[PDB]
Amino acid sequence: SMVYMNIMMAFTVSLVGLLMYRSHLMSSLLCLEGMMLSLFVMAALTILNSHFTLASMMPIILLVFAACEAALGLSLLVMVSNTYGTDYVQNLNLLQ
Amino acid sequence: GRATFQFLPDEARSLPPPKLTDPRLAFVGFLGYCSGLIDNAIRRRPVLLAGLHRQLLYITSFVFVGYYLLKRQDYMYAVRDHDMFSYIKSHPEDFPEKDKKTYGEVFEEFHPV
Amino acid sequence: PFFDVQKRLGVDLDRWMTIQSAEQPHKIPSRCHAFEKEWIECAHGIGSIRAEKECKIEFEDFRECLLRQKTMKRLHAIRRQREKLIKEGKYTPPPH
Amino acid sequence: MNLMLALLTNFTLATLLVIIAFWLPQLNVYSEKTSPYECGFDPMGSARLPFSMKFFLVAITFLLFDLEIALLLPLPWASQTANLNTMLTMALFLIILLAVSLAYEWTQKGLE
Amino acid sequence: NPIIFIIILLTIMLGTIIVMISSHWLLVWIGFEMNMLAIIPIMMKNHNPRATEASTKYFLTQSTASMLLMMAVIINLMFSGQWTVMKLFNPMASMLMTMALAMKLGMAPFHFWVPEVTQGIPLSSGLILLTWQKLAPMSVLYQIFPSINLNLILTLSVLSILIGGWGGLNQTQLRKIMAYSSIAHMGWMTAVLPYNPTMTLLNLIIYIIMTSTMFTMFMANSTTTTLSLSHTWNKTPIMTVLILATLLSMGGLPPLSGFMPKWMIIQEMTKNNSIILPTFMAITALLNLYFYMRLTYSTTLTMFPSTNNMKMKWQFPLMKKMTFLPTMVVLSTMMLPLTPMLSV
Amino acid sequence: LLQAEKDRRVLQMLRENLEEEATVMKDVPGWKVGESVFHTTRWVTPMMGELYGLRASEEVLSATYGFIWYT
Amino acid sequence: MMLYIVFILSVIFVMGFVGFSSKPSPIYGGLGLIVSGGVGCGIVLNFGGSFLGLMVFLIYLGGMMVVFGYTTAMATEQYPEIWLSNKAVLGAFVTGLLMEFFMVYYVLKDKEVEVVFEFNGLGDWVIYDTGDSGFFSEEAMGIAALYSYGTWLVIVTGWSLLIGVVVIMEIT
Amino acid sequence: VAAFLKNVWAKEPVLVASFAIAGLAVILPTLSPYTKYSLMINRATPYNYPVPLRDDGNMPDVPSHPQDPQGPSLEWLKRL
Amino acid sequence: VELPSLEDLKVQEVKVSSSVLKAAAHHYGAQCDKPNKEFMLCRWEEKDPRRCLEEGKLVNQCALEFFRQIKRHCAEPFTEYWTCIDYSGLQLFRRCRKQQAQFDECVLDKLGWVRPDLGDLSKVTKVKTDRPLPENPYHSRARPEPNPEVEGDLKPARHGSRLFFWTM
């Protein structure tokens, strides 16, 4: 019913100017690691309100990578700001 | 077709098979026979005929493989046809028998210069 | 290209979680379960390209078992047969 | 319906008690000089917090051992089944998939 | 170190084998979710301040690319509630599939990326592995194949083979020139795709070979165009007849095999009585050729041998299977009306 | 035994939520009495909105949310 | 404590996001999440799914975020001013907040307006349950433990994690 | 090699107590015959409701009255 | 849709708490089994618990005389028995174990019942076929018709691949 239009307007959290930008990359990477819960919850209802009884594990597997992988891509964000000290998306150097 | 993820099924028994001395199988590995001669020439062999143990084992490979592959190709064009006639045969309503008319009949255009 | 190995040899990779009615370990059903074994029965020997213009009946209600999309509208339209006339008579019900 | 009655009860004693401690004498009429004498016993301290790595990994290093002990969590519900061998043979895999993931990294912790 | 590099480099194809083998929407997530997990360290190996400002412009551009998909999987879990892999039962699914999946392949838009990564990965060794990621997605599009809005997958195509064409004429670095004109050949194979989707793969294999045999040749030291001038008077001239026996064949001319995909593809795209589409593709791959000419006027024109440069040593690279391919990248046209009935 | 008590409780429940509906109004642009939102015909367990109408006061709130959040 | 106690959570949730979906100086980014995550794990605890809700606290909100917060001392931002800092964040906010509000206003402020927002009725939680039932651990995600049928689902996830560390033992 | 196994137990006698328990829990489930009792008990617990089948002719066993002689022996547990 | 009237309703429901209802509850079903297993088969075998109301009044009936039976002979040990089990939480059966004999002293003895320990509610039983075993399953509209097959013979290709020229 209504709970399917919220949360959906929430899953436009993408909003992409705020997905790569502006600086403090950690804000961009943040709205990514919370782009989940729009994928999770939304898929923790349709599975639940009707009894699938089987795909019920799927919600668990939507995290176990969403944490595993998104925690990888954090790593690079040390390598960027190790050599700098400010992330600041404004580093372009490799060009085209 | 059926018996999926099979290189070829059992039904290919009824095909000739494509035995040797066809120009392709000869040609297959010819393009390898001009491949072997390369294989030397890249490294400054500089033989242009070097050890026959590299200058062979190619020709052995291609024509075997070229052969073992042509066995199914010819198959496929058979199962293509076979599934056509057997459909063309039924539904004769979709397949008319045209009449026979010589020229006491047809006019063309008729536009000479 | 879809090889479908699990058809040739014996293993089951997935094929179990796939649809709304398969097992459900203790044998407990879904809500719209009974319409699956109805709708799959329709298109099987079909090649699915005529399915869309053939069955379509056993499918639609199945889409309307799932979301309850219509019955909720004919319902919301009792709130207009009553509850505009509340003052105009037939309170409806008598309590109890 | 009585859980939220047992939560917002708890905070509202706590979110009360900040003001009746922090705030109440905070407007008292005593001196409270604005002098920059505060931030005890490292008087000035002008720097960025530098990246110090072996501080960092002990974050990551955990986060991954964490996941699967969510995967590992539904053992005691799964001890009630039909065919159980697919459990013991399978259950014991995760663990050894955890313990392996140690032994590798265990060549280098550094100073942890 | 050296063992694992074969554990990683094996897990990739295991990432893409669960893609082609599966029945089940979840697995085609996990399937190419663990590439963006298992690709990343290969970029690194020499730990430089590009690869690390590269794979981070790659990462978050294949992060959402995936993470939209999972939103267009769970739409038709609502409607019809049957996973598996077949037409998507609802238009907001597909339009959110195909034009958010074009991110991994990148098509007509969604490429400010393919030149920003392929350029300046310090590792040119390969970078042949960016021929896998062409091969994971297609092995969805072949299945979903009878659902597309059909006004799109052409509209990303025809805006592609154009936009990847013009992209390079202005380029010098020859890692880019392959980066460009690798959007191009993504214009032919997904322009076909609704009509008779095999005779796509045909263009897919003939592509994996030709771009493959380039790099293995570009590996000795070769980097910048004007380091391919110092080539013939230095390294070996039998190299130059090679780089002229392909770069020409790759845009294609009928006695070679590079002409083999077009020649067959248009048998298909007419006979469906669309004859005003293919000319414009057929005619636009033309000025896709003027990279290669003018690339090939670098090496046969004896241009100012580098300097006093004396390489008296022989070679010890791995040419592995280069001594084959440009006898199959060239001479195969005379052979085959197989490719339409062989893989089918 | 326990079940043979329930099935009677809903069939009693539909009738009153119908017989006390069809007597609300009979409208010319109205609905036929007890039509089916489906084409197919058999007994399909009804949705909460079927049993309890727009009634929506309390004993509903103790039905749907009754079990969850507490004894 | 009405029937609307679900609809009142989500529209706090939907407002949980737009805090950090613009540009807040990301030491307040967390405080846009642990509210959103919290209310998120709130909504799920209705509907009967419970175990699967109470995990998001354990595996993500509790466990994950702290790493997201244990850094941003390593990437540590400058003490310029933060939050209300630069005069720009505020401009982008409201137009989002009103956009559901003005949506939520006349979405249904009346009988119906109009069609696309009119096929969602409200207030009894029409669908939110069905009938009665028996019990298995509950009925639903009470049985979320399959080391039976699920195997090729685990053994990829089981194996895909084991490589998670090797990649990260290097670039580090 | 036993001199090794006593010369790691003069230095790290810790993980050795983990390996010592690492195996010895893997090995034994394939030994003691108490197991496979464990699989019989766990199959017989009626989570669900038994539904009576239709009897025309056979009807191999299991009469209308349950306590009459019907089917297998589960009472080897009651004495256990 | 067709629903029965308001009638054959308002029947006599057994009105007792949920503590007493589990007090005997045990001698109850093992010894009866006259309608009830059969009444399942008027549901599981054919669904739509509307077409089958009839045995519902038979199975509801069996209970009536049961609790009406027990009130005549001994309600005194029963009344005291379901008090302890009604002393509460979880309604365990292992607290009242002592008094279990006092209730069952003469019930199994005087009016001649038995303790159906583990054999009740197991040993999947049978009933009988009285009502027509229904065909015309639940919904069950139409087939529809499949594809005629193709086998015939296998020729080789006719003239050899017929591509553009490409003889063979």
From Swiss-Prot, chain A:
GO terms for cellular component: mitochondrial inner membrane; respiratory chain complex I. The keyword Isomerase does not apply. It is a multi-pass membrane protein. One of its GO terms (molecular function) is NADH dehydrogenase (ubiquinone) activity. Keywords: Electron transport, Formylation, Membrane, Mitochondrion, Mitochondrion inner membrane, NAD, Respiratory chain, Translocase, Transmembrane, Transmembrane helix, Transport, Ubiquinone. The chain crosses the membrane at residues 1-20, 28-48, 60-80. The keyword NAD applies. Signal peptide: none annotated. Its EC number is 7.1.1.2. Gene3D superfamilies: 1.10.287.3510. Coiled coil: none annotated. It catalyses: a ubiquinone + NADH + 5 H(+)(in) = a ubiquinol + NAD(+) + 4 H(+)(out). Its main location: mitochondrion. One of its GO terms (biological process) is ATP synthesis coupled electron transport. Core subunit of respiratory chain NADH dehydrogenase (Complex I) which is composed of 45 different subunits. Belongs to the complex I subunit 4L family. Core subunit of the mitochondrial membrane respiratory chain NADH dehydrogenase (Complex I) which catalyzes electron transfer from NADH through the respiratory chain, using ubiquinone as an electron acceptor. Part of the enzyme membrane arm which is embedded in the lipid bilayer and involved in proton translocation. This is NADH-ubiquinone oxidoreductase chain 4L. The lineage of its organism: Eukaryota, Metazoa, Chordata, Craniata, Vertebrata. The gene is MT-ND4L.
From Swiss-Prot, chain B:
InterPro entries: NDUC2. Accessory subunit of the mitochondrial membrane respiratory chain NADH dehydrogenase (Complex I), that is believed not to be involved in catalysis but required for the complex assembly. Complex I functions in the transfer of electrons from NADH to the respiratory chain. The immediate electron acceptor for the enzyme is believed to be ubiquinone. This is NADH dehydrogenase [ubiquinone] 1 subunit C2. One of its GO terms (cellular component) is respiratory chain complex I. GO terms for biological process: mitochondrial electron transport, NADH to ubiquinone; mitochondrial respiratory chain complex I assembly. Pfam families: NDUF_C2. The chain crosses the membrane at residues 51-70. Complex I is composed of 45 different subunits. Interacts with TMEM242. Belongs to the complex I NDUFC2 subunit family. It is a single-pass membrane protein. Its main location: mitochondrion. The gene is NDUFC2. It is found in: Mitochondrion inner membrane. Keywords: Acetylation, Electron transport, Membrane, Mitochondrion, Mitochondrion inner membrane, Respiratory chain, Transmembrane, Transmembrane helix, Transport. It comes from the Eukaryota. There is a minor unacetylated form of subunit B14.5b.
Swiss-Prot record, chain H:
Belongs to the complex I NDUFA3 subunit family. The gene is NDUFA3. InterPro entries: NDUFA3. It is found in: Mitochondrion inner membrane. This is NADH dehydrogenase [ubiquinone] 1 alpha subcomplex subunit 3. It comes from Bos taurus. Pfam families: NADHdh_A3 (PF14987). GO terms for cellular component: mitochondrial inner membrane; mitochondrion; respiratory chain complex I. Complex I is composed of 45 different subunits. Its main location: mitochondrion. It is a single-pass membrane protein. Accessory subunit of the mitochondrial membrane respiratory chain NADH dehydrogenase (Complex I), that is believed not to be involved in catalysis. Complex I functions in the transfer of electrons from NADH to the respiratory chain. The immediate electron acceptor for the enzyme is believed to be ubiquinone. The chain crosses the membrane at residues 14-34.
Curated annotation (Swiss-Prot), chain I:
Pfam families: CHCH. A motif (Cx9C motif 4) lies at residues 96-106. Residues 129-155 are annotated as: Disordered. One of its GO terms (biological process) is mitochondrial electron transport, NADH to ubiquinone. GO terms for cellular component: mitochondrial inner membrane; mitochondrial intermembrane space; mitochondrion; respiratory chain complex I. Residues 142-155 have a biased composition (Basic and acidic residues). A motif (Cx9C motif 1) lies at residues 32-42. It comes from the Eukaryota. InterPro entries: CHCH (IPR010625), NDUFA8 (IPR016680). Keywords: Disulfide bond, Electron transport, Membrane, Mitochondrion, Mitochondrion inner membrane, Repeat, Respiratory chain, Transport. A motif (Cx9C motif 3) lies at residues 74-84. Complex I is composed of 45 different subunits. This is NADH dehydrogenase [ubiquinone] 1 alpha subcomplex subunit 8.
